[PDB]
């Protein structure tokens, strides 16, 4: 059968091999949405060349590349299977990966979707919580594509731009959390402190009105509720770089802070991403749970498994898409509110591309 409904799976992406590290860094130092550099066209290829070693090196310590695409693909497969069944009237579904900064790129995927003569196209962000730096950027990419290619979509577009509190999303986290608690010694289960950890944002972004911290917080509370407040928790932020202020507490400082104060049994729960990648495998597992956590209380530090293959996550993804087609919704009500301090002319145009969509 010819595929009816396409599900564009959006995510920043990561370098698949060490060989990709360079072009990954180049595309992100060239994206004016995240960065405004002096002579950006000269500094970008330079900064990238000068930072490639260090990053190739990080991926080295995790087996030589990002698994993001592999998990995305398995997730992709499971979702489509379920959907061809959940709504037969939406015929064959097909999933497409659109990474922002590595192949297959957003622009490359939209192109293929067009060629397959699909009638319906859903931009399905893989960040459960919206930031203008993540989902927003993916969605600008779709707007800009059609602006550049200077032709209208030959297909009917809508978006799933957020989903911080989806009931099956919440369950997968809770399931993954319990079964990690079981891996701690029973003598120390109740004493376990939970740190929910997510990628920080520069304060300048926070103070502009980014929805992310508030949504990330909602995801936390929904999971603790389902867990029946069985352990104390705290939400902390990772991945800060540079001299500028970011939203804290920093995950690292928090790990050390807890140890110094007799809280030596810590569970790391990555709450803003759905699969393994550099943030989990190098940053949390190596940088913190191995090098940092020895040098402080070497009691227990574990990390909840990323949702990765979990068949329930598959069921979650499909139920979202299905529920979204059934509702005729073009985007969240939230997408219709740019942040109150926006200084990017593009978010308006992006938002209008989605709200305006035929059908």
Ligand X SMILES: C[C@H](CCC(=O)O)[C@H]1CC[C@H]2[C@@H]3[C@H](O)C[C@@H]4C[C@H](O)CC[C@]4(C)[C@H]3C[C@H](O)[C@]12C
Distance CA 300, CA 307 (A): 22
Residue 38 near its own copies by CB under 8 A:
no
Residue 241 near ligand X by CB under 6 A:
yes
User: Is 84 considered catalytic here?
Assistant: no
Distance CA 95, CA 122 (A): 9
**Residue from 63, 88, 150, 242 in contact with ligand X (CB under 6 A):** 242
146 is in an annotated binding site: no
Sorted by sequence, the CB contacts under 8 Å of residue 88 that are 6+ apart come out as none
Residue 147: what are its φ and ψ, rounded to 5°?
-65, -50
Of 190 and 207, CB closest to ligand FES: 207
Of 99 and 130, CB closest to its own copies: 130
Residue 195: what are its φ and ψ, rounded to 5°?
-115, 115
The alpha carbon of 165 is separated from its chain's Cα centroid by a whole number of angstroms, namely 14
Binding site for ligand FES (CB under 6 A): 132, 136, 208-210, 338-339, 342, 344, 347
Torsion of CA 239, 244, 248, 250, to 10 degrees: 40
148 in Cβ contact with 294 (< 8 Å): no
User: Is 319 considered catalytic here?
Assistant: yes
Angle ∠(352,357,359) on CA atoms, nearest 5: 150
The alpha carbon of 97 is separated from its chain's Cα centroid by a whole number of angstroms, namely 13
230 is in an annotated binding site: no
For residue 248, the partner it binds in ligand X, its own copies, ligand FES, none, with Cβ less than 5 to 8 A by kind, is its own copies
For 55-72, letters b (16+ CB in 10 Å) and e give: bbebbeebeebbbbbebb
Question: Among 20, 84, 210, 319, which one carries the catalytic annotation?
Answer: 319
Q: How far is the CB of 149 from its own copies (least distance, A)?
A: 28
234 in Cβ contact with 193 (< 8 Å): yes
66 is in an annotated binding site: yes
For residue 263, the partner it binds in ligand FES, ligand X, its own copies, none, with Cβ less than 5 to 8 A by kind, is its own copies
Sketch the per residue contact string, 204 through 233, with its own copies: x for CB under 8 A, - otherwise.
--xxxx-x-xxx-xx-xxx--x---xxxxx
331 is in an annotated binding site: no
> Which chain residues interact with its own copies by CB under 8 A?
164-165, 193, 203, 206-209, 211, 213-215, 217-218, 220-222, 225, 229-236, 245, 247-250, 253-255, 257-258, 261, 263, 332-334, 336-342
Binding stretches for ligand X (CB under 6 A): 12, 25, 28-29, 34-35, 37, 43, 47, 50-51, 54-55, 133-134, 199, 201-202, 204-205, 239, 241-242, 244
Q: Give the active site residues.
A: 166, 319
């Amino acid at each position: 059968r010819k595929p009816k409904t396409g599900i564009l799976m959006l995510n920043m992406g990561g370098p698949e091999t060490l060989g990709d590290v360079h072009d990954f860094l180049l595309r992100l130092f060239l994206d004016r949405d995240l960065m405004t550099l002096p002579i950006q066209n000269k500094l970008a290829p330079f900064i990238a060349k000068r930072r490639t070693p260090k990053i190739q090196e990080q991926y080295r310590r995790i087996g030589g590349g990002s698994p993001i695409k592999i998990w995305t693909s398995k997730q992709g497969e499971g979702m489509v299977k379920l959907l061809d069944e959940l709504s037969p009237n939406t015929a064959p579904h097909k999933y497409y990966i659109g990474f922002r900064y590595v192949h297959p790129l957003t622009e490359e995927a939209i192109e293929e979707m067009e060629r397959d003569g699909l009638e319906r196209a859903i931009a399905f962000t893989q960040y459960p919580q919206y930031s203008c730096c993540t989902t927003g950027s993916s969605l600008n990419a779709i707007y800009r594509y059609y602006n550049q290619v200077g032709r209208k979509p030959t297909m009917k577009w809508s978006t799933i731009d957020r989903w911080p509190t989806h009931h099956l999303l919440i369950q997968c986290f809770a399931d993954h959390i319990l079964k990690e608690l079981d891996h701690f010694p029973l003598e120390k289960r109740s004493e376990v402190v939970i740190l929910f950890s997510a990628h920080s944002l520069p304060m300048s972004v926070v103070n502009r009105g980014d929805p992310y911290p508030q949504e990330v917080s909602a995801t936390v509370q929904k999971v603790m509720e389902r867990l029946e407040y069985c352990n104390p928790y705290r939400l902390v932020w990772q991945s800060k770089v540079g001299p500028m202020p970011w939203l804290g507490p920093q995950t690292d400082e928090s790990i050390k802070g807890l140890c110094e104060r007799g809280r030596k049994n810590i569970l790391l729960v990555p709450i803003a991403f759905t699969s393994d990648h550099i943030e989990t495998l190098y940053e949390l597992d190596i940088e913190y749970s191995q090098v940092l956590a020895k040098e402080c209380g070497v009691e227990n530090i574990r990390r909840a498994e990323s949702l990765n293959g979990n068949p329930l996550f598959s069921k979650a993804l499909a139920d979202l898409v299905h529920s979204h087609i059934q509702s005729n919704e073009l985007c969240s009500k939230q997408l219709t509110l740019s942040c109150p301090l926006c200084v990017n002319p593009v978010c308006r145009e992006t938002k209008s591309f989605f709200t305006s969509q035929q059908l």
